[PDB]
Amino acid sequence: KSRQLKAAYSIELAQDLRAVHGMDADAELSGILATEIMLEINREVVDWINYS
Amino acid sequence: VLSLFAPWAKMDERNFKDQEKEDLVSITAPKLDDGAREFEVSSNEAASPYNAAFQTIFGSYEPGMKTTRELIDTYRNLMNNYEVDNAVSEIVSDAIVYEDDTEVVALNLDKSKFSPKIKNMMLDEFSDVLNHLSFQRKGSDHFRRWYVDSRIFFHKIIDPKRPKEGIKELRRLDPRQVQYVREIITETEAGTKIVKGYKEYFIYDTAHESYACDGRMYEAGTKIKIPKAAVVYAHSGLVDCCGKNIIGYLHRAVKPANQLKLLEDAVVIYRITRAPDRRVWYVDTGNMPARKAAEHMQHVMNTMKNRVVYDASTGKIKNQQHNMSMTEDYWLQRRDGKAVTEVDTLPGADNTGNMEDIRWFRQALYMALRVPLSRISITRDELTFAKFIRELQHKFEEVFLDPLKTNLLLKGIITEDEWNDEINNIKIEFHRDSYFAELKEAEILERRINMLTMAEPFIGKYISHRTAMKDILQMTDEEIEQEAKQIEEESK
Amino acid sequence: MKFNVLSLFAPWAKMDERNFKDQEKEDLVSITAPKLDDGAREFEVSSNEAASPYNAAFQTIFGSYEPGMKTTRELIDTYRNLMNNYEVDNAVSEIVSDAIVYEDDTEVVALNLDKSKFSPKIKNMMLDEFSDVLNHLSFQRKGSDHFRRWYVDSRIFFHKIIDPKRPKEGIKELRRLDPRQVQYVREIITETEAGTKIVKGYKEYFIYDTAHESYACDGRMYEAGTKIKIPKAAVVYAHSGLVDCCGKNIIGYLHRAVKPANQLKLLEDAVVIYRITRAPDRRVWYVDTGNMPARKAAEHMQHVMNTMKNRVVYDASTGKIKNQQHNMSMTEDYWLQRRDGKAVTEVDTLPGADNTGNMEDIRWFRQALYMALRVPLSRISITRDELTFAKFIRELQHKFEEVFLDPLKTNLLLKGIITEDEWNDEINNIKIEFHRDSYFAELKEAEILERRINMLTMAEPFIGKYISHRTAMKDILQMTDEEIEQEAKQIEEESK
């Protein structure tokens, strides 16, 4: 079964983050979304353990 | 604990036990000097369970990989520049000398050691240590990469089931993928000041399979803890203004290398921009919206399209047959007795150099690369450079002893105790250019003879032959006796 | 769907299947980063152990090489574009020419076998094969051309052939493959905890493209479509140690010079154009024609502009002013008619292509390029420049050299003379030596000898008490003990 996430962040947000704290605001999201998938799976497994 | 490092982990554990059993206590600063960056750990009295270490390595690796990444990429970019790569090339050429029917750095056991039997085995293994790197074919590049990147760390390869036979060649760890670190794990009153082990292991990424040149291609994942024992290494003793921010020799060029490139291009822009002629044709048109007023501009804009462009491959002018107009022919009509339209020419990039400012900088850069001033007999500058090369060789070549003691200990050629007392001095030694060595020696001899010549008339009056040999020819007492012996024999 | 290689290559594929079957049993396991320094481009694949049929292999070989195969093609042409320019080509020439020479009634680059062997018969067999290797390169006629192309691109490949029914004697002339259509990769299909630490063969895959779809010059073809997967055993190749800042993005020996090569060319053109544009007298003639639209005002202009017109052109074949009569006016005597009582009608003159150089930057840049192209810079006795040059040439020769070593060791296995194991455990040294210029070699030696002789003549007054003769010979003449004894023995014989 599949699992996917989309961010599609704005231009202005990224420009602001670069201006505010030197951030790129793309990679950060890449990180967050990938992170969210790994963690979500981790939970799915744990929850299935309790489920069964 | 990943199994690929099992025997190395055991080696580190043994070293740690010895540290734990020592008296190195009352330490106000952890006893580290250079290389690896430390980290304060949980120190549950002395404990750090592997699972505690796992986070510890993440928290050591994140805050600083970027710095390493920037420095290495910078050095590599510097390496691709005009007269920078050459500095390295000459340094590499002298640091790693390899010629026809010539040796490579080789173990030289000319000082007391356990036994000639062992000395011979050690030499044979040393040869394999280098054969494993194809040193005799690519040793110069292994060095070249190190010098440029400032640091080399290699993965040791094991079987490990039969680790006398199951001893394999090294794999250079990917620079920028591995962090050299230390961990302080132990607790005392008012800060920890007791037998810290420091660990001195490495932290490896999974991002090493890098693609997308000059990009930022990364993915989520775990990190690898690598035992000290598992890695062969050397690095330049160069650190930036603070911390353990290790830099390379090439770091020196970061400013001026770019300043020169920038200046070179600035000169070029100045010469090219404005090289073409320059002029604005003007037309003054009213009584119409610009959409239509502009038609009077078209009357010249679409008429004086002097597309007389020079061909880049052959120096001819596009579509200008016949071969040459002696003069251009232009004219403009005026609606009234008002000189309002015009051809406004512009000043160009006149010929003012004086390529002297850039000269200063290029020269400064050139020497700043840590190269002889003789590069574009024997002088202080050549000797100084040779000393530099000796230092680089001295520090770099530790990478051939690390795997040597490792392999010898595993095989049973040497014991740990023996290594520890034997070195001291288990040096290795390389070939140096014979062309110049001969010339150097010849000049030394010229002085030696010239002084004997000068001394000559007083040889039986104020001074002696023994002394002249000792002070003028700089011979040892033993050397003199042996030459005297040979000389007497030659007479018959 | 699990297709094999075109059968004509199968014998080479078989050699590789065996090579990998044994590499796979090797103990180079428990390795984090892949055990690879150079050559073919690595790539992490499907982790499926032995699932490497044509379709699957193409997918990842292609996916691996694709994001940069364009770049690779651009570099080839970039390096060639430099090679096609003047003051570039001559640097290459100097290097290629000295790297490979042929001479008057001399030998050519040749295999030097001076190490222990089971039986000397092998030395002859290897030498005989070597000579034939050169015949299959036709090195004696085009070896320097192979080198030149190799040098410029920093790589060369050749396609090897077999019978194939009697492959052992199918060894014949190689065909040079232009890198433009050549792809090379190392693929990983195994997996363990946290990545792949398994001994990996990588299969060293080559792919040869089909239609001449890509091009430098026009006359190109339609879409290539599929491509052919080729075993490495089938390809003779060599390449430089010069790689860009990522992967295996290999670069040319002239790569360094690309910047200044192009820069100098721009500067050169800037000079050429600067002095041409605006060389002739320039001006705009203006006629004041009140109360007229251009369609009519133009007649007033014609009455002036087509009356005063100097219909003059310059004969560039014969340095003359075409049909100029009279030969030369003493004054360019022109006039302008002012219809109104106002000084408005005029001529708007422009500046010309004045000689104001100070033509210095062009030398700065010429010199930088000249050196970027690989010194000696002495070209417009024995010096450091020559000595480092010679070292460079040997380094090039040692990479180029693989072009001989590959088919040599292959042919000696394929024809069943030496086993693979024996070759690998024996050399340890299979050096192929080049012929070098004897003019320069003699001069180098003569100058060295003069100094040695001069030093012997300094030792002379003291040698009788201070220096042994053996010492003078080994220190000044740099003679070996055996060499010393041999001359001494000959010297007594010379008496008669």
Swiss-Prot record, chain A:
**What highest taxon heads this organism's lineage?**
Viruses
* Reported modifications of this chain: A proteolytic cleavage by the prohead core protein protease gives rise to the mature major capsid protein during virus maturation.
Q: What does this protein do?
A: Major capsid protein that self-associates to form hexamers, building most of the capsid in association with pentons made of the capsid vertex protein and one dodecamer of the portal protein. The major capsid protein self-associates to form 160 hexamers, building most of the T=13 laevo capsid. Folding of major capsid protein requires the assistance of two chaperones, the host chaperone groL acting with the phage encoded gp23-specific chaperone, gp31. The capsid also contains two nonessential outer capsid proteins, Hoc and Soc, which decorate the capsid surface.
**Family that this chain belongs to:** Belongs to the Tevenvirinae major capsid protein family.
Assembly and oligomerization:
Homohexamer. Interacts with the portal protein. Interacts with the capsid vertex protein that forms pentamers. Interacts with hoc; one hoc molecule associates with each capsid hexamer. Interacts with soc; this interaction reinforces the capsid structure. A total of 960 subunits of the major capsid protein forms the 160 hexamers.
Q: What is this protein called?
A: Major capsid protein
Q: Which gene encodes it?
A: gp23
From Swiss-Prot, chain C:
Any one of the GO CC terms: membrane
| InterPro entries cross-referenced by the UniProt entry | Portal_Gp20
Compositionally biased tracts (Basic and acidic residues): 486-496
Q: Which terms under GO biological process does the entry name?
A: symbiont genome ejection through host cell envelope, contractile tail mechanism; viral genome packaging; viral release from host cell
**Location (main, coarse):** virion
**KW Membrane (keyword) present:** yes
Q: Does the keyword Ribonucleoprotein apply?
A: no
Name where it's found.
Virion; Host cell inner membrane
Q: Indicate the segments annotated as coiled coil, or none if absent.
A: 472-496
Q: Oligomeric state and partners?
A: Homododecamer. Interacts with the large terminase subunit. Interacts with the major capsid protein. Interacts with the capsid vertex protein.
Protein task: Forms the portal vertex of the capsid. This portal plays critical roles in head assembly, genome packaging, neck/tail attachment, and genome ejection. The portal protein multimerizes as a single ring-shaped homododecamer arranged around a central channel. Binds to the terminase subunits to form the packaging machine. Attaches to the host inner membrane most likely through interaction with host yidC and forms together with chaperone gp40 an initiator complex to form the prohead.
Q: Which family does it belong to?
A: Belongs to the Tevenvirinae portal protein family.
Name of protein: Portal protein
Q: Which organism is it from?
A: Enterobacteria phage T4
Underlying gene = 20
